[PDB]
């Protein structure tokens, strides 16, 4: 309720660039898995929240390296006796691989698919995922359809060449005595990124996840 | 922009208040403050140059940092064919000036 | 098309823009040496040099003209009108500007004249016009006898005064400038009134199917505003 | 003997004349390089550069002292406190001259003592002071406590300020000038004092045959005023 004004001193450009714009390191995803799914799974996307959506959905054409830092936190259940040092692995399946069924799964000691091995008592693990993408950017937007038959037309606006892969993590030694709760934060941080085409924002709140729908509000 | 038929004439008096200063309430105030006459008669259009704005945040919120007024000068004269109401648009943009700082999240979800 | 910026105002004009100086002279500052036998004054380049537009004027088919003088119509407006209460010395030109509105299906002849020291008639009596019937403000007054000029002469011979023609089917607008027009080198703006600025309907205005409203603005802009100067020191 | 010629207004002073500069910096008008990141101001050189003297007041034997907030002093008073009502933006120094009338027997020393954001005490309280504490406009305050300085700090180390000592056995005069003290190029006049000018009686005044009176003139003159444009041009 109090008129405040300040005199604003400004200068350089640099902070508005669309690599620092574009280049902050955001919760992506966030899920929680019991001792014994068994397993964390999910494909890697933009669209999961939608602070980063509407970023990104300012552009029709970003192509971009992911940064993946996943930050695990575990909490026991029920006497006590510490929080164990498990052991966990961190598989990146590509678009054309299989993924793992269960946690004794064949496709974990697949050696095309690439795994981190890291610890509760260490530091987050991090890797680079390089633009694995056919074409030469990602289409946030796609006015067309994969193809032409039936069971394809009710999938508009999807295209195959926009995934961007799936990311496994396991509990290598997963059965302990008494109980277990892990956390896993994946964090994304876009590098060398480059856009175009930039698009209106969007004001409609999203009606879901793949069909940019809109309804009132 | 005035989108009105061709014949369609008139004036119109576009003020602009600095930042503090009070918006204008009749004609004359504003005519008195920095003005245009747009004739739209003859001028389909007409651009604006607003000096400078600024704003931040800091309950405390940024004061006002001007007004853009019209006031209808004359009255809208069209002939009997044309269509007795008109319609006038207005766009916005930022010179090669304009800077901002401290990115953060937007409130629109 | 373009635009007659003056400091503080723009007005958007044809491109006709003929620009009658009066007398072939532009306005322009009191002369040194002219300016030694009498008190020096401290020129205002802002803000008097602007544009003034007063309300606008509804052209009927019977109207007879109306009429401005200066700097009575802008003796309380703004800057300028700030300006005249504080000073008791006044020096300044003018530029009026006077535009129509009319479709091509309207008709009508406008005589925009500029009359120096028009002194009212009051037709009919032999007493002279009072205070109220001469200042009338930025308001201005009414012909009553436009043929004879409410001055007993005629408005067939007033074309010898700076005169600008608006025809509705050639032009809209008319532009004539003013130079300092008195016999004294500074005079006072409260008491008398250098100009008359007068437009009369020489063909009346008409037509079939339109507003016959037609409306007309007019706007005035001092051009070299000098006043006596009001912050001399007196020490030495 | 001289004269303290400022535009419209002059003093006669002593030949001191001594002229403290706070912080050996002359007053001077916002550097260019500093004023492309905000607004351009305009700079009135006329008349806000005058010296506005207050109504003299009286120095007696059980005298705390009085301050003057700047520009809180000025700002209903003349053209300084006309142009702060309609411009939002402001930045200007300042130049306070204290004068003092006694005669040969009179004795008291007096420190002009010029407090930066002087923020006031309200002592034995825990409310902040209202506006009506603060905000006492050319009438001014007195101090309370003046040997704490009214803001917890003590008069022994405020020697570390802009001073000039007034002995009566010695001069009668001070003049000290305040450059724009400041964080941010321009500031808001109506709401924020950068200066506080203390006049503070550290020996207290005595005589036996004189009047006990002894007032005490003050002179404050803006020197280099800016303030926001409030004219420019929107065509183009």
């Known amino acids: 309720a109090i008129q405040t004004r300040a005199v604003i001193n400004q200068h350089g450009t640099s902070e508005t660039l669309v690599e620092n714009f574009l280049g902050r390191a955001a919760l992506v995803m966030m899920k929680d898995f019991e001792y014994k799914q068994n397993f964390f799974k999910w494909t890697i996307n933009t669209r999961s929240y939608v602070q980063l959506r509407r970023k990104f959905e300012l552009f029709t054409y970003i192509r971009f390296d992911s940064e993946i830092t996943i930050v695990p936190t575990i909490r026991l259940y029920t006497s006590y006796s510490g929080l164990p040092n498990l052991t966990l692995q961190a598989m990146f399946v590509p678009v054309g691989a299989p993924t793992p069924k269960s946690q004794d799964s064949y496709e974990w000691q697949s050696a095309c698919n690439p795994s981190v091995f890291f610890k509760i008592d260490d530091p987050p693990a991090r890797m680079t995922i390089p633009f694995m993408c056919i074409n030469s950017a990602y289409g946030m937007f796609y006015d067309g359809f994969a193809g032409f038959e039936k069971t394809a037309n009710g999938l508009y606006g999807i295209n195959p060449a926009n995934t961007m892969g799936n990311l496994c993590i396991r509990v290598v030694n997963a059965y302990q005595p008494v109980q277990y709760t892990i956390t896993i934060r994946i964090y994304l941080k876009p590098k060398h990124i480059k856009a175009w085409v930039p698009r209106p924002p969007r004001t409609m709140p999203y009606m879901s996840i793949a069909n940019t729908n809109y309804t009132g509000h | 922009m005035f989108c009105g038929s061709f014949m369609a004439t008139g004036k119109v008096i576009l003020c602009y208040t600095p930042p503090g200063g009070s918006c204008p309430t009749d004609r004359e105030s504003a005519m008195l403050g920095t003005h245009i006459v747009w004739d739209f008669g003859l001028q389909s259009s007409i651009t604006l140059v607003i000096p400078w704005i600024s704003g931040s945040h800091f309950k405390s919120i940024n004061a006002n940092v001007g007004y853009v007024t019209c006031f209808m000068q004359t009255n809208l004269i069209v002939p009997k064919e044309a269509a007795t109401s008109t319609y006038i648009i207005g766009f916005a943009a930022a010179k090669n000036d304009f800077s901002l700082r401290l990115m953060r999240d937007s409130p629109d979800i | 098309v373009l635009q007659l910026k003056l400091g503080n105002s723009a007005i958007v004009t044809q491109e006709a823009a ?83 509105n009319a479709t091509k299906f309207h008709q009508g002849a406008l005589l925009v004249v500029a009359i120096p020291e028009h002194q009212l008639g009051k037709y009919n009596t032999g007493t002279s016009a009072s205070f109220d019937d001469v200042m009338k403000g930025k308001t201005g007054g009414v012909f009553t006898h436009p043929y004879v000029l409410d001055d007993g002469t005629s408005l067939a011979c007033s074309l010898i005064f700076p005169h600008q023609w608006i025809n509705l089917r050639t032009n809209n607008s008319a532009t004539i400038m003013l130079p300092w027009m008195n016999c004294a080198p500074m005079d006072f703006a409260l008491r008398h009134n250098q100009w008359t600025l007068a437009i009369i309907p020489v063909v009346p205005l008409n037509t079939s199917g339109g507003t016959t409203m037609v409306p007309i603005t007019v706007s005035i802009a001092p051009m070299c505003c000098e006043f006596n100067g009001l912050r001399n020191a007196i020490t030495q």
């Open chain 3, 18 to 100: 003929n620009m009658c100086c009066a007398y072939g002279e532009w306005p322009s500052y009191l002369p040194d040496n002219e300016a030694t036998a009498i008190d020096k004054p401290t020129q205002p380049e802002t803000s008097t040099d602007r544009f003034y537009t007063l309300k606008s004027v509804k052209w009927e088919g019977t109207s007879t003209g109306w009429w401005w003088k200066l700097p009575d119509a802008l003796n309380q407006t703004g800057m300028f009108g700030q300006n005249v209460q504080y000073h008791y010395l006044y020096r300044s030109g003018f530029l009026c500007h006077v535009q129509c």
